[PDB]
Structures are given as structure tokens and as C-alpha cells.
């Protein structure tokens, strides 16, 4: 079986800048599009099962765990569920300037544990072959990076793929961390269009995938700068104990303070 | 298997069939590997795309894949070229099945089936239902051909006994669905029942058959509402097999023993265990009742105590080995109707006759070196006029 | 007593179930069979208890098939197992219960025994009695009276007519008891004979050795071992132990042969001590007490010899300590069994490995020697690896069209040389014993015809032995085969499955059977069996190939041959066809090969 998870990145400050600009595309039918996809991905198999995260910048919040129109009452309890969440979620939400970046790393934490508590619980007979749909909004934070890396490897360990979809601007961090664990990487120019994009790139799973035609992986600028000014560097000169990547051969490195010998 | 159910079918009944609560997913289900996603792809497309698309769509390798879901769609017409979308009735259907618009009940199950089989063979104790004897000989797996005189059991039927339960119920409820259209009950009707469970006049006769057959119980007098058993949707063995064609099974259950002693002799009867002897003369009475010693070996193999489980294969290669060879030494002599002409002379001319019957479909055996060819007489008025004509012509 | 609609015996009304019906791995029918579990935890005690009060009659892997008799329940007693003592831990092991004919035969059994005491002292046979009212009411028919020679009651009895006089007890249900009391007897002093401790003794040979000494009394029965499993050190350390004087009785040169090696081997008992009363060769068989010699001597009918005559003589005036009989299941015929009551013996032991034959005279070893004390286990000595490992097969060979022609044609027996000589199957053998040559593996060729051994072996141009074969030839050829390494095959006639000391070989090739007998078909098998230095169950080292005919009568022998190995547990693959025949250059392939054979075996007559 499949368990999706869907980390939607539901920042108000770009959304509403979107509402202000009164642009065709709105967070309501980016909302609509991710549930689409979620029924599809259900609608699949029986045995597959499916998940939600949005991202705020203050924390993440889980956006799921008759046929009064005729409907398969399990989509019909998924519709209701994701709508009154995520309208509670976006009415109710405090204001901090200081901070307003999108925490998206933050909630990939959550779907990892989440994938390996639903891994855990599932039967062993049955084989789960999780992945997690991000779907980023906004520009990424620069001090996220650390934490970032860490859920991007303990991805990589935990064999669940990272299949990144930006709109609207092309975070490196993301592609870099869905490189890595070999997710795919589509950057759809139309919004509007988007859910197109997400029946066919997306929503095929890892055993389907390989025979496949998808777009071209996009080439991934592994770059390095100094600690100093920030700027790539091709030549790096860590320590034994930061492992820090440097600008220039120094006495001794300021986040060591160590004892460093000359030769 | 339902794939083939399906696809011989017609596209007048197959639009109508696709209703909209339940058939949309449960022939989607049966979609094996890969249409599952071509389908939901072009779910949401109002204008069809070419069908170069389709075919560079997968790569290079598993493109059998590729063309096999596509010929299977193809049959089953979800699409049309149209020059590939989709039906749009299939389409919308889909879309509003799409975001759009227990432990008695299993034992209830086995028992019913349990006297059904009892029924089945020639116990003296069991359920007593005209319609049931009737649909069973109708079936083709029974024939009576005397009211008064209990039906007895054809060839086909011990093949049937001898199927296991799931392949069975498939079999029979498949039966159940060729005869139904020839008593003249709607099949599109009985049909999209069965795809809405595992999710009128003639639906209560349907469902009174399905509840004969034990697959639902309403439980409640007979009303509107039902709650169907584990085999409306769609164990460990017993028998224990030695090296000396002795067979230990432990069955409390009369079916297990009165299947086993169709092709074994019974020795001894415990309350919790009973003894068999697979000699020749129940095998090969088994044989010409119409087994075959495929069934017998599936059979003892699904019915396999733990205990021999262990070793690799399950079943002894002599029992299996001796059980193959006792039913391949059942049959030798022929039979057919021929007659003989001779004398055919001319070498190059007696190769233009063997054409002839060839042909026609009236030549058995033949012979360049005698020149003699036999003829059936069922077409004796036929090639004697030809070989007339080649006189004639000389 | 009760048939159920198929041939079905119905016990449902006869016994009930015990509720921990899993815990108890043990089933008991009214008629005595018992079906033990392999796979229970408590398999180990179980198979004790069974093979101490019954006789296994069928030990697959899985479920082992025991039948218990009147003379099984008498060894238990004489190994001292009371009714109560046997009877209780069946019915705590029997998970159905124990059926009230089983119990009433049970306590009838063991209570008819003991009362009745046959004790032998200065050459008189006295039935002793402790209770008087046997003898009282044992006197009521004629056959007694005129068979007696003309508390603790006892009397004299005819030395000839001592073995009617026991079969007449059996069915009178008042069994004799023939243990020895060798601690306790100073009429015969002992004999200076120990057991060195070079000798090894096995678990089983000694759970065998346990069965016959129930106590410091020699008991006298049989001993049912594999002739791999080392029955030959049984028989020697059973002699030792006796420290009396022992005669053995082989039952040909071969036999005789190798109880002198066996003797000289495992005991420290001198070179001088041993005679061979063999008519080819003696050794003063008057000068020293421990003896092997052969039925047909010391039954022979005929004339006497003065030497032999003197020889046996010297053995009938002199009382025998022990009196070892090779292959007992031989003993029941006419005169092997007249050297029973030829030769005096406090205790009759007897050894054997084929303890079966089709005629009901095997019973009658009960009487003539004793209960039969324990049967090895052939599986359980395969797994423990003391025997080697046996890849059990049957070849079929599609009979030739013409040799089928007159075969069924003719009415007559010319069949028996026929069927055994065919195109198919005698390019079989030669293939096969190329293929196993060129694998460096020892064959052991049989066949029971001695013309068509003597056609096999002189086309292939082998070392057949049969028939009067001379002693020194049959040594010589012997010898070849154990150590010369451009020789690897044998070809032994019947007299192989007699008794032979032959060295262990890697395949065993049947060409031809005497019949569906299950004794020689085991005899044979036998000889595969032992284990060597350092092989492993699963490698199936060793091979036995019996080549049938098919379409022929050769088909009905063989499967009327294996049932005692089937039952036993090995499975007899059958081979159709063999690879590479076709490509291996054999003769008999074109038709005209094939037809001279044909004329030869028709000019044969
Ligand atoms: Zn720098
Ligand atoms: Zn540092």
C-alpha cells in the first residue's frame, strides 16, 4: 500500500498577498486542488491511505488523522474535515513581525514521525511505501537550513521519497533536499492549471514511476561559501571539529577556538 | 475470471452497466497496474488528446504494460478516439464517485455453503429447496433427468466438489449470472449488486438466492436492510499424507470426509481425526467419475496439515508421482468412422486428392507410400465427385 | 467389529476422547495397532514405552505404526513390566482412552505368564510350577502324557518333543519361560571370557543388549538389527558377556568367514580358542570350546563323515553356554530347525536383520528361540548416521516391442530370462554402471537368475560370482574388489544375500529379483548401509537401483518386493527414462543387436 502526505505550505503572508493582488489564483483553490488529490490518491486503492499538514509561520497543524450528494463516504468525511480544519486554522492566527517566514521544514519533522508511527502500527505482512508530497509557497528561511538537512537525511534513511512542488519561486533548499532522496522536482509556471500537473507527475507512486515518462530532473547546484561574507567557494578548509566550510587558511578558526599547530 | 466476464460484453449493455454508485470503481479496481492512473489523469479533460501521446507516455522498457492496459481498455471502452477521452458517462460517474455528487455472519457463511455441498453430494441429510436443486441442474454440474428419483451428480459436478471454496463460489455465481439471463432476469440489475457489496421483483429473487446460497443474512425477517457475510465480497490445512498412500485427516465436518473418501478408501473414523487409504480402486474410480489427478493433488495440497509443511514439496513426489500415474493408465484404445479407396496409381495425382480432404475436414489418416487415404463417411458424397471430376479431367 | 459405510472400522461408539487430546500423542485401536507421533515432544518416552510392550510393524517418519501381541506382552513381562505398570502409562499416554479388549487382553496376557517354568538341568528338560493347578488342569489332553518320558512342582519331559510340547503351550495360554539364570548356576562353570575395551558398544546395541538381560539371568530371544548397525559386535559382545561356552551358526562359508574375523577382532579370546567346524576347513573343532559352524553341517541328514560324525558327536555329548543363530529367519525351515533340538543350549541367541517372510512360520521363532527382545530403528540409525544414508530407487525400463512380442505370446516361464534380459534394461545396467565407475563408486551387481548373470558378467567381462563359485575364487575376487582400484564391481548371485562379509558400497544395482519377497529385497539393501568414515545423511552417498521391466510381471514382483522398505520409510523413486543413454555407445541399440540377443535367449530353452 501508499500512505501520502500532503505538507501543504499555507502561509498567510503570501496568500494574502495573493488575495490583495486579487490574482486569478487564490489559496481556496489551491486548497480545493490539494483535495482533489487526496481523493484521487485514496479513490487509487482501499489500501492506501492519505494524510495533510499545513504550515503556518507560528507552528504546523495536522489537517487530517451520509451520502447527502451521493458520495463515497469516507471522501465525503475527508472533504468536511480538511475544510472546517483549515478555515479554523487560517480565521484564528496570532500576529508576530518578527517572525513571518514559513516554517516548512518544521512539519516534515511531523510527517516523518507520523509515517514511521503509521509504519509501525500497520501490519507486517503488508509493505507501505510512504511519500511526501510538499507543495511550498513561499521563499524558505535562511536559519532553517540546519534542521532542514537533518529531516532530508532522515528521509533518505528511512526510504521515503520527498516529491517537491514549488510555485511561484524555486527554493533551492527544497530542491536540493528532494534530490537527494531521489522525490521529484516540477515547478509548475500555472497555478491555475495545477492540478493537471499533480494527476500526472505526482500522483503516480514509486512502483509506477520508473516506467514512466516525467519531466527531466532539474540540475542542483550543490554550491559552498565561507562562513564570512556568503559566497561560493570551490575550495573549503573545515576543522576536525566544526567541520565548518571556510574562507581562507587562518591561525585559528573562530567557531573552534582551538589550539591549531603550525607546519 | 470478472476481467473476462466484462469484456464479453456488449457497448449498449456496458454504458448502461456503468452505474453510477458502484461499477465506475469496481471495474476500476480490476484495473491491474497502470490504467488506474491513465484513467484518473484524464478524469478532469473535456478534450481528447491524440494517441501518439498514449503510446510515448511509457518508456522504452514494460511497454507490453503499456500495450496490454491500453487493449484491455480499449475492450472494455472506457474511451473512444474520436479522431482518447473518455466516455463521458464513465467520466462523470467516476467524478462523482470521486469527491462527487461479523464473526456469526462469516460461521453463517460456512455453514450454508457446508449443506449446499452436502446437498451437493448424495447425503441423506440435507437442506431441501426446489429452486436450489433446480438452479444446481441447470448449472450444468447436475442432472436429474427423473422428478421423482433425487438428481444425481455428472462429471463436471465432482470437478466442481473438488474446487475450492473462493474458485467455487466464482464458478457458481458466474453459472448463477449465464442463467439468469436465460430465465430472463436482467443481468445488468443482479450484476451492479455484486460490485455495490463489496464496497424491485428481481432484486428480491436475487437476493433470496444469495441468501440461499448464504453470502447475505438480513437477519431481520427478511427486510429491507442487509449485512453481507466475508464471501459476499468476493485456513489452515487438516490432511495429513504419508509415504505409504495413507491419509490421517482431522475433520469433525461430514464434507471434508465424504470428499475425501471420493477418491480414497476409509479405514477409520475418530472423533477428532479419521483414516484413509488412496489405493487404485478409489483413484481411478474417482478418474472415471471425471476427475482428473490435478484436483486430487490441489485438494490433499490446500487441505495440507502444518505438520508437512515443513517439508519441501508439501505432498510426498510418490503419492503425486503414483496418483499421475494411476489416471494417466486410464485410457488407450480409439474410436472413429472412415472408408478406404485404393489403387490411386499415379504418384503426382494422389497428392492433389489429400488436398481435398483435407480441407473439408473428412481426412483422418493418409499414406504416400501405399497410396490409400481414408475418408469418414460423413463426407463420402463430396470428395468422391472431386476425384470424378480429376478422372475427367485426366 | 463395526464397518462403517466405507471400509471404514467404526470406533465412535467404542471409545471415547480424552479432552487434552493434543497433549496425548498416543491412539489405541480395539484390534492392538497403535499410531505414535514423530512430531510430539514426548515422541523419545513414547517410542520407549511402544517398543517395549509391542512390535513395530511400520515407523515412517512422520506417524509410526506398533502392533501389540501376545508374545510382545510376555517380553515386557520378562523385562518385568507388570499389567498395571504397562497398562496405566497407556492409558495416561493413549488420548482416546484404552477400548475394554485391549485391557481384558492386556491383563489375560500378562497374567498366563510365569506360572509355567521350563528349567534344563543334567540334560533334563523339568517344566517347573510354583502353582500346581497349571499342571493339574494342563494335564487334560493325551499329547502330554505321551510326550513326558516313560511346591514348585515340576517334571521331566522328552528331549525331542520339547518343541510341540511349546507350540502347544502358546495356544494353551501358559507360555514357558526360558530365562537363564547364569549368575546363579554352578552346574557349568563359567567360561574365561571377557570383553576388552577396544570394543565400542552403540545406544542402541546397548538398549538392545538391556532388552535381553532383564537381569543377571541370560535371557534367550531375538535381536532385530540392520546389518550395517553392527549386529556381528552384538552377537560378540553378548558372547563375551555370557563367559560361557558359544557356538554360532552362520548360514554359509562367507558367514562363517566373518564371525571368525568379527570373534578375533572385538574379542581378546586367542587365535587357537576359535575352531570353524567347516567341512572346507577345520581348525580341531573338538580341541576348543568357543565354535562357528553352519545349519546345513550341523543338520545335515545324510551320511556322515567319520571326522564330522566324531565333530558332531563331541557337540551333541557337551552343553553350550550360548548358542548364536545368524539370520533366524531361516530357522523355522525343516532342518535348520532340527539343530535346535540337535545342539544343547541354556540360551539360544538369535541376530538377524530381515526379520520377515511370507509363510506364518515366523511366529513359530517365538517358541523356537524367544520372544523377539528389539528391533532397530533403520530411520533413527540413518539420522544418528551409524548406517549410511540410501538413495532408494527404482529404475522402469520400457520393455522392447519384439521381447514384449513373445513374451505375452508365450504362456510358459521363459518370461523369468526374458523380462531380465531386455535391450532397455540391459543398456540401462551397463550405463549405469558406467556412470558410477567413472564416479568411482563400488557396485554390488544382483541378480537371482545365474544364467543371466553369467550372461551380464561375461559381456561385460566382470568378476560374476554364483552357484559353486570355489572358496578361494570367491575370497580372491572378494579381495580385488576391496582393494584393487581398476576394479570397482561385483556381480553376486543369491548367495550374496545369504550372508556375506562384504565391504561397503556405494551403489547396489538389482537387475533381476527372485521374486516379491520383502527378506531378500532388505537383505540386499542391506549391504549399502554401512556408514562411512566421514559422510552426511543428506549427501545420499549411497544408491540402490532395483531395475524392473515394464509391462511385465517384474512390475507386480517389485512392488510385492518394497513394501517392507516403504513401510520402513524410503521412498523408491521411479526413473522412466535416464539421460545420456542415448549418447553413451550400449550395445542392443540398433534393432539387429537386439534381435541376436532375442534368438539367443529363444535358443536357450
Ligand atoms: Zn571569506
Ligand atoms: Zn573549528
Not at chain 3, 112 to 122: D, Q
Amino acid at each position: 500500500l501508499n500512505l501520502l502526505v500532503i505538507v501543504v505550505d499555507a502561509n498567510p503572508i503570501w496568500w494574502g498577498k495573493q488575495a490583495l493582488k486579487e490574482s486569478q489564483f487564490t489559496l481556496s483553490k489551491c486548497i480545493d486542488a490539494v483535495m482533489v488529490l487526496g481523493n484521487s490518491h485514496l479513490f487509487m486503492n482501499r489500501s492506501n491511505k492519505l494524510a495533510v499538514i499545513a504550515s503556518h509561520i507560528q507552528e504546523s497543524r495536522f489537517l487530517y488523522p451520509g451520502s447527502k450528494d451521493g458520495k463515497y463516504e469516507l471522501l465525503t468525511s475527508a472533504n468536511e474535515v480538511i475544510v472546517e480544519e483549515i478555515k479554523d486554522l487560517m480565521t484564528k492566527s496570532d500576529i508576530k513581525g518578527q517572525h513571518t517566514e514559513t516554517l516548512l521544514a518544521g512539519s516534515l519533522a511531523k510527517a516523518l514521525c507520523y509515517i514511521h508511527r503509521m509504519n509501525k502500527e500497520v501490519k507486517d505482512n503488508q509493505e507501505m511505501k510512504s511519500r511526501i508530497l510538499v507543495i511550498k509557497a513561499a521563499e524558505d528561511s535562511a536559519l532553517q537550513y540546519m534542521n532542514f538537512m537533518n529531516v532530508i537525511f532522515a528521509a533518505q534513511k528511512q526510504n521515503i521519497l520527498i516529491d517537491a512542488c514549488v510555485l511561484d519561486s524555486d527554493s533551492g533548499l527544497l530542491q536540493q533536499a528532494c534530490d537527494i532522496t531521489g522525490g521529484l522536482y516540477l515547478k509548475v509556471p500555472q497555478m491555475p492549471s495545477l492540478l493537471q500537473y499533480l494527476l500526472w507527475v505526482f500522483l503516480p507512486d514509486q512502483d509506477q514511476r520508473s516506467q514512466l515518462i516525467l519531466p527531466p530532473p532539474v540540475h542542483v547546484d550543490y554550491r559552498a561559501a565561507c562562513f564570512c561574507h556568503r559566497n561560493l567557494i570551490e575550495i573549503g578548509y573545515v576543522c576536525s571539529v566544526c567541520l565548518s566550510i571556510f574562507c581562507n587558511f587562518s591561525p585559528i578558526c573562530t567557531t573552534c577556538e582551538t589550539a591549531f599547530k603550525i607546519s | 475470471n470478472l476481467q473476462e466476464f466484462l469484456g464479453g460484453l456488449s457497448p449498449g449493455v456496458l454504458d448502461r452497466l456503468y452505474g453510477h454508485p458502484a461499477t465506475c470503481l469496481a471495474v476500476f479496481r480490476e484495473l491491474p497496474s497502470l490504467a488506474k492512473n491513465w484513467v484518473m489523469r484524464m478524469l478532469f479533460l473535456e478534450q481528447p488528446l491524440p494517441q501518439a501521446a498514449v503510446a510515448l507516455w511509457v518508456k522504452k522498457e514494460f511497454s507490453k504494460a503499456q500495450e496490454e492496459s491500453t487493449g484491455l481498455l480499449s475492450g472494455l471502452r472506457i474511451w473512444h478516439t474520436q479522431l482518447l477521452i473518455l466516455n463521458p458517462i464513465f467520466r462523470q460517474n467516476l467524478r462523482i464517485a470521486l469527491l462527487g455528487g461479523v464473526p456469526s455472519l462469516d460461521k453463517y457463511a460456512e455453514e450454508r455453503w457446508e449443506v449446499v455441498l452436502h446437498f451437493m453430494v448424495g447425503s441423506p441429510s440435507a437442506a431441501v429447496s426446489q429452486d436450489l436443486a433446480q438452479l444446481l441442474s441447470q448449472a450444468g454440474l447436475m442432472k436429474s433427468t427423473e422428478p421423482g428419483e433425487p438428481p444425481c451428480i455428472t462429471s463436471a459436478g465432482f470437478q466442481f466438489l473438488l474446487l475450492d471454496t473462493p474458485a467455487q463460489l466464482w464458478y457458481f455465481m458466474l453459472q448463477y449470472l449465464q442463467t439468469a439471463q436465460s430465465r430472463g432476469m436482467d443481468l445488468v440489475e443482479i450484476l451492479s449488486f455484486l460490485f455495490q457489496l463489496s464496497f424491485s421483483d428481481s432484486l428480491l429473487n436475487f437476493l433470496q438466492h444469495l441468501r440461499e446460497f448464504g453470502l447475505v443474512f438480513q437477519r431481520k425477517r427478511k427486510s429491507r436492510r442487509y449485512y453481507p457475510t466475508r464471501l459476499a465480497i468476493n485456513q489452515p490445512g487438516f490432511i495429513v499424507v504419508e509415504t505409504n498412500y495413507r491419509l490421517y485427516a482431522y475433520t469433525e465436518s461430514e464434507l471434508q470426509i465424504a470428499l475425501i473418501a471420493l477418491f480414497s478408501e476409509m479405514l477409520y473414523r475418530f472423533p477428532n481425526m479419521v483414516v484413509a487409504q488412496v489405493t487404485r480402486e478409489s483413484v481411478q474410480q474417482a478418474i472415471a467419475s471425471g476427475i482428473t489427478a490435478q484436483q486430487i493433488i490441489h485438494f490433499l495440497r490446500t487441505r495440507a496439515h502444518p505438520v508437512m509443511l515443513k517439508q519441501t514439496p508439501v505432498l510426498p513426489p510418490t503419492i503425486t508421482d503414483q496418483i499421475r500415474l494411476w489416471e494417466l493408465e486410464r485410457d488407450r484404445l480409439r474410436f472413429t468412422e472412415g472408408v478406404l479407396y485404393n489403387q490411386f496409381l499415379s504418384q503426382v495425382d494422389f497428392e492433389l486428392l489429400l488436398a481435398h480432404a483435407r480441407e473439408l475436414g473428412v481426412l483422418v489418416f493418409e499414406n504416400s507410400a501405399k497410396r490409400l487415404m481414408v475418408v469418414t463417411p460423413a463426407g463420402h458424397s463430396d470428395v468422391k465427385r472431386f476425384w470424378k471430376r480429376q478422372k475427367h479431367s485426366s | 467389529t463395526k464397518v462403517d459405510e466405507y471400509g471404514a472400522k467404526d470406533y465412535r461408539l467404542q471409545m471415547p476422547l480424552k479432552d487434552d487430546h493434543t497433549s496425548r500423542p498416543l491412539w489405541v485401536a480395539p484390534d492392538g495397532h497403535i499410531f505414535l507421533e514423530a512430531f510430539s515432544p514426548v515422541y523419545k518416552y513414547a517410542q520407549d514405552f511402544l517398543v517395549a510392550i509391542a512390535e513395530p510393524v511400520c515407523r515412517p517418519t512422520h506417524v509410526h505404526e506398533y502392533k501389540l501381541t501376545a508374545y510382545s506382552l510376555y517380553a515386557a513381562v520378562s523385562v518385568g513390566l507388570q499389567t498395571s505398570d504397562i497398562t496405566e502409562y497407556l492409558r495416561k499416554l493413549s488420548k482416546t482412552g484404552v477400548p475394554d479388549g485391549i485391557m481384558q487382553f492386556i491383563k489375560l496376557c500378562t497374567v498366563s505368564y510365569g506360572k509355567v517354568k521350563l528349567v534344563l538341568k543334567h540334560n533334563r528338560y523339568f517344566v517347573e510350577s510354583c502353582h500346581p493347578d497349571v499342571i493339574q488342569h494342563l494335564l487334560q489332553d493325551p499329547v502330554i502324557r505321551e510326550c513326558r518320558l516313560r511346591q514348585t512342582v515340576s517334571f521331566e519331559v522328552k528331549q525331542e518333543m520339547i518343541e510341540e510340547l511349546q507350540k502347544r503351550c502358546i495356544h494353551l495360554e501358559y507360555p514357558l519361560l526360558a530365562e537363564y539364570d547364569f549368575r546363579n548356576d554352578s552346574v557349568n562353570p563359567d567360561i574365561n571370557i571377557d570383553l576388552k575395551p577396544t570394543a565400542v558398544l552403540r545406544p542402541y546395541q546397548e538398549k538392545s543388549l538391556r532388552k535381553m538381560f532383564g537381569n543377571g539371568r541370560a535371557r534367550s530371544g531375538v535381536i532385530v538389527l540392520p546389518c550395517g548397525a553392527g549386529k556381528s559386535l552384538v552377537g560378540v559382545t553378548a558372547a563375551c558377556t555370557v563367559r560361557k561356552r558359544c557356538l554360532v551358526l552362520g548360514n554359509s562359508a562367507v558367514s562363517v568367514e566373518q564371525w571368525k574375523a568379527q570373534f578375533k577382532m572385538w574379542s581378546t579370546i586367542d587365535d587357537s580358542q576359535i575352531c570353524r567346524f567347516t567341512s572346507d576347513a577345520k581348525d580341531k573343532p573338538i580341541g576348543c570350546s568357543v565354535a562357528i559352524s553352519t545349519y546345513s553341517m550341523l543338520g545335515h541328514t545324510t551320511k556322515r563323515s567319520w571326522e564330522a560324525e566324531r565333530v558332531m558327536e563331541w557337540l551333541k555329548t557337551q552343553e553350550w553356554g550360548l548358542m548364536i543363530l545368524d539370520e533366524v529367519h531361516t530357522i523355522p525351515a525343516k532342518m535348520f530347525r532340527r539343530v535346535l533340538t540337535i545342539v544343547q543350549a541354556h540360551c539360544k541367541l538369535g541376530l538377524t536383520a530381515t526379520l520377515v517372510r511370507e509363510d506364518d512360520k515366523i511366529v513359530d521363532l517365538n517358541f523356537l528361540i524367544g520372544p523377539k527382545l528389539y528391533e532397530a530403528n533403520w530411520m533413527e540409525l540413518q539420522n544418528n548416521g551409524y548406517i549410511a544414508k540410501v538413495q532408494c530407487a527404482e529404475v522402469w525400463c520400457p520393455m522392447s516391442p519384439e521381447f514384449y512380442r513373445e513374451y505375452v505370446a508365450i504362456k510358459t516361464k521363459k518370461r523369468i530370462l526374458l523380462y531380465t534380459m531386455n535391450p532397455n534394461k540391459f543398456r540401462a545396467c551397463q550405463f549405469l554402471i558406467k556412470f558410477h565407475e567413472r564416479r568411482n563408486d563400488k557396485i554390488i551387481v544382483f541378480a537371482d537368475n545365474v544364467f543371466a548373470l553369467k550372461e551380464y558378467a561375461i559381456r561385460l567381462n566382470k568378476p560374476y560370482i554364483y552357484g559353486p563359485t570355489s572358496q578361494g575364487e570367491r575370497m580372491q575376487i572378494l579381495q580385488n574388489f576391496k582393494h584393487n582400484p581398476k576394479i570397482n564391481t561385483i556381480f553376486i548371485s543369491k548367495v550374496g544375500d545369504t550372508s556375506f562379509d562384504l565391504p561397503e558400497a556405494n551403489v547396489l544395482i538389482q537387475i533381476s529379483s527372485h521374486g516379491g519377497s520383502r527378506r531378500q529385497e532388505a537383505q540386499r539393501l542391506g549391504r549399502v548401509l554401512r556408514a562411512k568414515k566421514g559422510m552426511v545423511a543428506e549427501e545420499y552417498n549411497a544408491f540402490f537401483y532395483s531395475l524392473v521391466s515394464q509391462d511385465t510381471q517384474e512390475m507386480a514382483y517389485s512392488t510385492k518386493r518394497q513394501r517392507f522398505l516403504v513401510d520402513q520409510g524410503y521412498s523408491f523413486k521411479v526413473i522412466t527414462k535416464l539421460a545420456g543413454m542415448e549418447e553413451e555407445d550400449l550395445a542392443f541399440s540398433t534393432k539387429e543387436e537386439q534381435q541376436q540377443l532375442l534368438q539367443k535367449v529363444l535358443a536357450a530353452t
